[PDB]
Design a protein around this nucleic acid. Structure first.
Ligand SMILES: [Mg+2]
Ligand SMILES: [Mg+2]
Ligand code: NA
Ligand code: NA
Length: 318
DNA sequence: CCGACGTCGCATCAGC
DNA sequence: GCTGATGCGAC
DNA sequence: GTCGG
């Protein structure tokens, strides 16, 4: 449906969700607004009254009201006020820096650090992640055309095969769903000798060695979060690398393939057939007792157990 | 009326 | 020192 | 904020 049917409404709701999350620290109202924004975006008629909106699930008495106000006046008094408020719009802004969440942004603004310039002048009050978040603020909000993703994937598979030819790597995310662009790169790793440490680090190390990986946000025994750059300049880009055991690998690939709404929908159907699915395993439900993890050897095994027809990654927007 | 609302790895903090 | 809590980025 | 036990 064209943005311009209810775009003004969904934008109002999105911006309200952001203030809830970033300024108020009400994660649940932040999800409540997002859920209402999503259900309205998908609605194929120009909304004419709050009461009409109110029939959608996740739209309730107070969002119906705000919708009427927006229909009557082209705006919300409350959102106009919060927008112009120096403190609140700074807190909300600073959270766009990767590594600065609602709590650091509050603490910065409290001591009068409100802008990126203020951030640049005070690097010693930033932790490591936060400095990298700052040094790449602009790069991090840019999108990744599929063409660069394929070239990034060429580099990742090649270097992974070179470290040890028995690794299995799959790039997940919207890339894997065939999206024309991506926000970042998510790489899933496993190795036959890993089931239920150096295996992760050795790969990270090879990608630093050929200068693909440039910075490190965090790195553990199973997850790496970092930054990479195609050789020339291209923007710097977010890359995660996770090492999963073999018998959880295909669950990992399904989950990190997503999307969101697809996984949710699939968890929900999974529910109605007496199964649960997290990032690791699929388990039958007992009185409601999740039992032992079932064997899984492809993505398909999972879709089978729940009696759903395999879906091509292509067809997993929802 | 009032509790649920997704779940988890890593970095860094508070506190013993 | 250590453990357990909290912030943060994430389908 | 919305939903539902
Ligand atoms: Mg070999
Ligand atoms: Mg992703
Ligand atoms: Na409703
Ligand atoms: Na942030």
């Amino acid at each position: 449906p064209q943005e311009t049917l209810n775009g003004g409404i969904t934008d109002m709701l999105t911006e309200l969700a952001n203030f809830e999350k970033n300024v108020s620290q009400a994660i649940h109202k932040y999800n409540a607004y997002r859920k209402a924004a999503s259900v309205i975006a998908k609605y194929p008629h120009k909304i004419k009254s709050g009461a009409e909106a109110k029939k959608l699930p996740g739209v309730g008495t107070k969002i119906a009201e705000k919708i009427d106000e927006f229909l009557a006046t082209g705006k919300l008094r409350k959102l106009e006020k919060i927008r112009q408020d120096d403190t609140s719009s700074s807190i909300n802004f600073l959270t766009r820096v990767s590594g600065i969440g609602p709590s650091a942004a509050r603490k910065f603004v409290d001591e009068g650090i409100k802008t990126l310039e203020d951030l640049r002048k005070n690097e010693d009050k930033l932790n490591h992640h936060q400095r990298i978040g700052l040094k790449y603020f602009g790069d991090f909000e840019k999108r990744i055309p599929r063409e660069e993703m394929l070239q990034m994937q060429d580099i990742v598979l090649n270097e992974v095969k070179k470290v040890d030819s028995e690794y299995i790597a799959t790039v997940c995310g919207s890339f894997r769903r065939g999206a024309e662009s991506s926000g970042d790169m998510d790489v899933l790793l496993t190795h036959p000798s890993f089931t239920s440490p150096k295996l992760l680090h050795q790969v990270v190390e090879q990608l630093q060695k050929v200068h693909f990986i440039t910075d490190t946000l965090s790195k553990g025994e199973t997850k790496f979060m970092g930054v990479c750059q195609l050789p020339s300049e291209y923007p710097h880009r977010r890359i995660d690398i996770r090492l999963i055991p073999k018998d959880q690998y295909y669950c990992g690939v399904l989950y990190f393939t997503g999307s969101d709404i697809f996984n949710k929908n699939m968890r929900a159907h999974a529910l109605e057939k007496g199964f649960t699915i997290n990032e690791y395993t699929i388990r039958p439900l007992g009185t409601g007792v999740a039992g032992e993890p079932l064997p899984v050897d492809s993505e398909k095994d999972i879709f089978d157990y729940i009696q759903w027809k395999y879906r091509e990654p292509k067809d997993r927007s929802e």
